[PDB]
Amino acid sequence: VTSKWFNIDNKIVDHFP
Amino acid sequence: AVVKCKPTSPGRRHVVKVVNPELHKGKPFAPLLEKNSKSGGRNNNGRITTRHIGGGHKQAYRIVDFKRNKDGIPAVVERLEYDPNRSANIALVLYKDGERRYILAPKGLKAGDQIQSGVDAAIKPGNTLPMRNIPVGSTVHNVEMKPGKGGQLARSAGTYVQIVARDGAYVTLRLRSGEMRKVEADCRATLGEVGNAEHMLRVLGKAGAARWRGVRPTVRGTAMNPVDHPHGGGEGRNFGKHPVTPWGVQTKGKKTRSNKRTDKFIVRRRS
Amino acid sequence: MKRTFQPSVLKRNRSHGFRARMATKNGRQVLARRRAKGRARLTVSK
RNA sequence: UUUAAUGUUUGAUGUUCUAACGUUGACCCGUAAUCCGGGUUGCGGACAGUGUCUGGUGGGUAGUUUGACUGGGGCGGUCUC
RNA sequence: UUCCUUGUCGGGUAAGUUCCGACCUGCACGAAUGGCGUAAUGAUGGCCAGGCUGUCUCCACCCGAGACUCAGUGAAAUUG
RNA sequence: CGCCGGAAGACCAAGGGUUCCUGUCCAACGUUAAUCGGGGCAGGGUGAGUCGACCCCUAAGGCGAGGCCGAAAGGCGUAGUCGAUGGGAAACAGGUUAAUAUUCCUGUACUUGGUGUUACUGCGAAGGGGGGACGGAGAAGGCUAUGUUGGCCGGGCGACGGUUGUCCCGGUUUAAGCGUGUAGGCUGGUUUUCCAGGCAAAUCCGGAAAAUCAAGGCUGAGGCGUGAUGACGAGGCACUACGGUGCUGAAGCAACAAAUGCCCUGCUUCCAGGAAAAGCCUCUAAGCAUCAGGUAACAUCAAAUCGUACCCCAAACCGACACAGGUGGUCAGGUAGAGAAUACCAAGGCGCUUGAGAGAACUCGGGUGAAGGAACUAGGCAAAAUGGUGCCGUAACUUCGGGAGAAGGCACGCUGAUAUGUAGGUGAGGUCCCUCGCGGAUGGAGCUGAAAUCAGUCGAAGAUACCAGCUGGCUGCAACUGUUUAUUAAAAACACAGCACUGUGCAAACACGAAAGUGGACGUAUACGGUGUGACGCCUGCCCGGUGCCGGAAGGUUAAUUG
RNA sequence: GAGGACCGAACCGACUAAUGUUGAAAAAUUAGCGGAUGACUUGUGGCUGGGGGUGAAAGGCCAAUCAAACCGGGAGAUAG
Ligand SMILES: N[C@@H](Cc1c[nH]c2ccccc12)C(=O)O
Ligand SMILES: [K+]
Ligand SMILES: [K+]
Ligand SMILES: [K+]
Ligand SMILES: [K+]
Ligand SMILES: [K+]
Ligand SMILES: [K+]
Ligand SMILES: [K+]
Ligand SMILES: [K+]
Ligand SMILES: [K+]
Ligand SMILES: [K+]
Ligand SMILES: [K+]
Ligand SMILES: [K+]
Ligand SMILES: [K+]
Ligand SMILES: [K+]
Ligand SMILES: [K+]
Ligand SMILES: [K+]
Ligand SMILES: [K+]
Ligand SMILES: [K+]
Ligand SMILES: [K+]
Ligand SMILES: [K+]
Ligand SMILES: [K+]
Ligand SMILES: [K+]
Ligand SMILES: [K+]
Ligand SMILES: [K+]
Ligand SMILES: [K+]
Ligand SMILES: [K+]
Ligand SMILES: [K+]
Ligand SMILES: [K+]
Ligand SMILES: [K+]
Ligand SMILES: [K+]
Ligand SMILES: [K+]
Ligand SMILES: [K+]
Ligand SMILES: [K+]
Ligand SMILES: [Mg+2]
Ligand SMILES: [Mg+2]
Ligand SMILES: [Mg+2]
Ligand SMILES: [Mg+2]
Ligand SMILES: [Mg+2]
Ligand SMILES: [Mg+2]
Ligand SMILES: [Mg+2]
Ligand SMILES: [Mg+2]
Ligand SMILES: [Mg+2]
Ligand SMILES: [Mg+2]
Ligand SMILES: [Mg+2]
Ligand SMILES: [Mg+2]
Ligand SMILES: [Mg+2]
Ligand SMILES: [Mg+2]
Ligand SMILES: [Mg+2]
Ligand SMILES: [Mg+2]
Ligand SMILES: [Mg+2]
Ligand SMILES: [Mg+2]
Ligand SMILES: [Mg+2]
Ligand SMILES: [Mg+2]
Ligand SMILES: [Mg+2]
Ligand SMILES: [Mg+2]
Ligand SMILES: [Mg+2]
Ligand SMILES: [Mg+2]
Ligand SMILES: [Mg+2]
Ligand SMILES: [Mg+2]
Ligand SMILES: [Mg+2]
Ligand SMILES: [Mg+2]
Ligand SMILES: [Mg+2]
Ligand SMILES: [Mg+2]
Ligand SMILES: [Mg+2]
Ligand SMILES: [Mg+2]
Ligand SMILES: [Mg+2]
Ligand SMILES: [Mg+2]
Ligand SMILES: [Mg+2]
Ligand SMILES: [Mg+2]
Ligand SMILES: [Mg+2]
Ligand SMILES: [Mg+2]
Ligand SMILES: [Mg+2]
Ligand SMILES: [Mg+2]
Ligand SMILES: [Mg+2]
Ligand SMILES: [Mg+2]
Ligand SMILES: [Mg+2]
Ligand SMILES: [Mg+2]
Ligand SMILES: [Mg+2]
Ligand SMILES: [Mg+2]
Ligand SMILES: [Mg+2]
Ligand SMILES: [Mg+2]
Ligand SMILES: [Mg+2]
Ligand SMILES: [Mg+2]
Ligand SMILES: [Mg+2]
Ligand SMILES: [Mg+2]
Ligand SMILES: [Mg+2]
Ligand SMILES: [Mg+2]
Ligand SMILES: [Mg+2]
Ligand SMILES: [Mg+2]
Ligand SMILES: [Mg+2]
Ligand SMILES: [Mg+2]
Ligand SMILES: [Mg+2]
Ligand SMILES: [Mg+2]
Ligand SMILES: [Mg+2]
Ligand SMILES: [Mg+2]
Ligand SMILES: [Mg+2]
Ligand SMILES: [Mg+2]
Ligand SMILES: [Mg+2]
Ligand SMILES: [Mg+2]
Ligand SMILES: [Mg+2]
Ligand SMILES: [Mg+2]
Ligand SMILES: [Mg+2]
Ligand SMILES: [Mg+2]
Ligand SMILES: [Mg+2]
Ligand SMILES: [Mg+2]
Ligand SMILES: [Mg+2]
Ligand SMILES: [Mg+2]
Ligand SMILES: [Mg+2]
Ligand SMILES: [Mg+2]
Ligand SMILES: [Mg+2]
Ligand SMILES: [Mg+2]
């Protein structure tokens, strides 16, 4: 199955650039 | 006659159309029609080999006589017709024996005119003679390159060739591009110019008018990515390189003629 | 919305049928591999 | 050292020629056929074109490289005696 | 496109880092990788006004579907 | 009682494959129970000369004897042969099963072949000609499907004031075929002679000439007659397993309105200039000639095979699900309305496979709100507001088209009169004429029917519900309509008409291919490819030192080769 | 009676907000929104194949996968 969308979403995931 | 359209729409503002009222309003002559289905620019491998070709209006092919080898028999012009396959107009002629043929309509020719091909015809627009029987200096069209092969040069609307000299078995022509070419004197040519000389004065006016002629959009190479075009790429609008074709060959100046077996027939290249 | 499988028996037979496998050398090797494996259905036919 | 003559030619350029070769010119036949082949003829003609060898060009395409130390990496500096 | 910079002057506001007009000191505009204008057009960007309003001052009440209780069926992520 | 009704109704194609109908069972399946079911088990059910496939004919395209090309495998392609989404013969109405019906039954039809008899006779193709055979938009006329009202027929006299009438309810249907040839559309007709054309021939097609006639021919919806002394028919009567079954059966007309359907593959007009082949008609060649063959009438025989149940905007197809998603075509009733929008309804079909209570916070979808009115916020986000027809009126700017529905304003219901229903539309009877019929002129009965003015009247409100633009001022960017990141970006990005440079003389440049070949193009420099810019207006200045490209040939350097 | 003309249903699309986010749905619903005779839209069939196609150009799309598809093999690649 595909992963949870919130784990895909760049805004949520990449929060600490 | 060129007529400007009235700006009742933004797509009508710049339209200029060439309307000829002497054309035949009716169906073409059926026995001289063929099927002519479109390609899309694709060869027998299925691949696009010429870009920006596709769609357009359905067309039928008119079997035009480019040889004009029905010698000795006079023919009267019946009508002028529209041809969707070329820029010039075509005229339907009727021979004395009862045969009908299409020809390229020369300039100034009307319905009822008399034409005649052969070696002993008269020097008037519409008649086809071997170029050894045509005066030096004459304006001809529909010129042959090989005797009996058919006319190939000066076919499209308004074009013509001038006979500059005749020395031996060859005649020197001044082609419409400005090139001086030698052609043997047994090849045929038709007197006069090709009609419809204001075909170039028309303005399509909108983007859909080019799509009615089977012309699809051109994307600029500088607007692509580097994987697509040598010009592709950039953060903003960059260029920074010599202009080339999509296959890396220099455009804008670089000559591409390499034909060593026809260089002897070319007196002077165009300039 | 529209999914990827839109069935059509004519396009199913013209693409993966028996007469279409038997037409090329590579299609006859697909049939030799499936007979060697022992499959109950060689091609997708009637 | 230096030249001219005769005989012979080699290499260069030029001029014609036809018979190899080309023909996406015309006609005839296989043939109920815009493929192909054969025949006649015209136009080119030892050119073009192809093979082997060879110089140039060649991000069109391919395989790769692009150091370490370092009060984080980069930049700067340094690397042996 | 201007870093310094919310440059300076004028307009609009009681008060305007945005907006409009002008100045020229253009860090670092500029003529077909176009310059300057431009009627019409745009689910395009910025600003102002009239109308309108629970957007707000500041929330109140009401009508339905859940949440709550009863009977039947009955999951999930996680977990030394 | 509620919901849909341009569907959530009906019929199919694609796809599925027994889900169809009947009996029986309730373990599992159904988001609960289940006596029920698209679930389990058993039995039954799909009937064709005319519908569809198969069949004949072809398009794009596929395969491809020889052939051309290629280390091999293979690629391309001629003659051919396949390939529908297109062209090609013929059936309708009624009745019937639990479940099929244009297939079964009743009635009435039609098509194509084979054979035989009779009568007459130039038949014959792998060839020639015709035909089939074709675009977009627009306009109008003639019609029908269909609807409404009247008439006619059957029934009724009303749970509560009135209801023997200008009252209420229901019905008023009928096909293909055959005959006639009308509104409309196209076209001159006939005869004779001759001819460098249609690969040969031709009486056919094309061309030329002459004579003569004022008409002929082709096509064509609808109507009318017949089909039909039939069928159907509101109801009524007689039985019943109360599901249903049997018998009989009245009227069955007219006017008006009217399509997006038909005449119409028509007509008018525009440019972007709009399939192929066979069936069909005709001409002849080789050939055959008291043959064979052709034409007409009659009789007779044949028309095989496969599909046919059921669902098909869906619980049966594609989505793992009985999943708020997706899915091509056909049919198209009433009132209001411009309308296939919208509201309420008919035929028809449904209430969405958990319910019962309670009436906390909070969440979701909505209704209303004192005074204020953007003070909210990144930002008037979201809400609120505007909203129709007719008429008056409307600025800067402009490419003279626009801007513009600018802005803003007024009227709007019902009743009566003008006018017992007007202007307009339709048009019976009667009369006259002829061409005696689907004809013309006159005539006006009946039916239908806006819009306006005047007067009166009700409410707070008359575009009363549903439905239905917020408007204005300044400015950046892109000319404009379009296109794009399927699934966080619709934009100032891409495209564009226009402009410029450049390559290309035809076996074109260029592109796909070890090649043959193909596209470019059955085009020919007013054409084609590549690059940049991007409507239009005013314009586009200086630099050739660098890199690139174009031209040059003296000299220097310089490969294989030779030795 | 022209028009890549205007308003607006079918049809094609996807600008804003709210809901949903172990969803009714691995991209939808509701209320608004754009085009709506054209560079339109749609059915059936066909052709182009992986360093290849196609692309009004976003590295977009090529079976819920794309700066190099999927399946099988080299293969137990190599992994300071
Ligand atoms: N959140 C939304 C949209 C979404 C789907 N897939 C995603 C992947 C990444 C981010 C968001 C999404 C949903 O669940 O329907
Ligand atoms: K024909
Ligand atoms: K472009
Ligand atoms: K760029
Ligand atoms: K020769
Ligand atoms: K050579
Ligand atoms: K250190
Ligand atoms: K540190
Ligand atoms: K700047
Ligand atoms: K002020
Ligand atoms: K101020
Ligand atoms: K501009
Ligand atoms: K926009
Ligand atoms: K703007
Ligand atoms: K059970
Ligand atoms: K369920
Ligand atoms: K078909
Ligand atoms: K024939
Ligand atoms: K004739
Ligand atoms: K059936
Ligand atoms: K409660
Ligand atoms: K409106
Ligand atoms: K857009
Ligand atoms: K773009
Ligand atoms: K050019
Ligand atoms: K061609
Ligand atoms: K220079
Ligand atoms: K320079
Ligand atoms: K230079
Ligand atoms: K119009
Ligand atoms: K219209
Ligand atoms: K299509
Ligand atoms: K790949
Ligand atoms: K897949
Ligand atoms: Mg191009
Ligand atoms: Mg261009
Ligand atoms: Mg880009
Ligand atoms: Mg590159
Ligand atoms: Mg830049
Ligand atoms: Mg020679
Ligand atoms: Mg590289
Ligand atoms: Mg390696
Ligand atoms: Mg380091
Ligand atoms: Mg450091
Ligand atoms: Mg100020
Ligand atoms: Mg602010
Ligand atoms: Mg300013
Ligand atoms: Mg700039
Ligand atoms: Mg610059
Ligand atoms: Mg420049
Ligand atoms: Mg400007
Ligand atoms: Mg737009
Ligand atoms: Mg419970
Ligand atoms: Mg568990
Ligand atoms: Mg875990
Ligand atoms: Mg079953
Ligand atoms: Mg059932
Ligand atoms: Mg149960
Ligand atoms: Mg069922
Ligand atoms: Mg069952
Ligand atoms: Mg069962
Ligand atoms: Mg082939
Ligand atoms: Mg081998
Ligand atoms: Mg066939
Ligand atoms: Mg049934
Ligand atoms: Mg024919
Ligand atoms: Mg009728
Ligand atoms: Mg009675
Ligand atoms: Mg009575
Ligand atoms: Mg009473
Ligand atoms: Mg009644
Ligand atoms: Mg044929
Ligand atoms: Mg399914
Ligand atoms: Mg499903
Ligand atoms: Mg599954
Ligand atoms: Mg359900
Ligand atoms: Mg569903
Ligand atoms: Mg649909
Ligand atoms: Mg509706
Ligand atoms: Mg009903
Ligand atoms: Mg209580
Ligand atoms: Mg509540
Ligand atoms: Mg209030
Ligand atoms: Mg108030
Ligand atoms: Mg504020
Ligand atoms: Mg504040
Ligand atoms: Mg809003
Ligand atoms: Mg003003
Ligand atoms: Mg004006
Ligand atoms: Mg105006
Ligand atoms: Mg107005
Ligand atoms: Mg600004
Ligand atoms: Mg734009
Ligand atoms: Mg995306
Ligand atoms: Mg996106
Ligand atoms: Mg978006
Ligand atoms: Mg070009
Ligand atoms: Mg640009
Ligand atoms: Mg300049
Ligand atoms: Mg040079
Ligand atoms: Mg429009
Ligand atoms: Mg899209
Ligand atoms: Mg949306
Ligand atoms: Mg919506
Ligand atoms: Mg709109
Ligand atoms: Mg619209
Ligand atoms: Mg719309
Ligand atoms: Mg178009
Ligand atoms: Mg994908
Ligand atoms: Mg790779
Ligand atoms: Mg491993
Ligand atoms: Mg290995």
Numbering used by the authors:
A (entry chain B5): 8 to 24
B (entry chain BC): 2 to 272
C (entry chain B2): 1 to 46
The authors write:
Free L-tryptophan (L-Trp) stalls ribosomes engaged in the synthesis of TnaC, a leader peptide controlling the expression of the Escherichia coli tryptophanase operon. Transcription initiation of tna is controlled by catabolite repression, while the expression of tnaA and tnaB is regulated via a transcription attenuation mechanism resulting from the tryptophan-dependent stalling of a ribosome producing TnaC, a 24-amino acid leader peptide. In the presence of inducing L-Trp levels, translation termination is inhibited when Pro24 of TnaC is in the ribosomal P-site and the stop codon is in the A-site, causing the ribosome to stall. Our structural data reveal how the ribosome and nascent TnaC co-operate to capture a single molecule of L-Trp and explain the role of various functionally important residues, such as the strictly conserved Trp12 and Asp16 of TnaC, the 23S rRNA base pair A752:U2609 and residue Lys90 of uL22.
In order to understand how the R23F mutation leads to increased tryptophan sensitivity, we prepared E. coli 70S ribosomes stalled during translation of tnaC(R23F) in the presence of L-Trp and analyzed their structure using cryo-EM. A major subpopulation (~53% of particles) corresponding to ribosomal complexes with TnaC(R23F)–tRNAPro in the ribosomal P-site could be identified, resulting in a structure with an overall resolution of 2.4 Å, referred to as TnaC(R23F)–70S. Clear density in the region of the nascent polypeptide exit tunnel between the PTC and the constriction formed by ribosomal proteins uL4 and uL22 allowed us to unambiguously model the backbone and side chains of residues 9–24 of TnaC(R23F). On the other hand, the density corresponding to residues 1–8 was weak to nonexistent, consistent with the negligible impact of TnaC N-terminal deletions on ribosome stalling and previous reports indicating that the nature of the N-terminal residues of TnaC is not important for translational arrest. In the stalled TnaC(R23F)–70S and TnaC–70S termination complexes, the C-terminal half of TnaC folds into a compact structure consisting of two short consecutive α-helical segments—α1 (residues 11–15) and α2 (residues 17–21)—connected by a ~110° hinge centered on the side chain of Ile19. In addition to the TnaC peptide, we observed clear density for a single L-Trp molecule near the tunnel constriction. The indole side chain of L-Trp makes contact with both the ribosome and the nascent peptide, and is wedged between the base pair formed by residues A752 and U2609 of the 23S rRNA, and residues Trp12, Ile15, and Asp16 belonging to helix α1 of TnaC. In this work, we identified and characterized a TnaC variant with a single R23F mutation that undergoes translational arrest at much lower L-Trp concentrations than the wild-type TnaC.
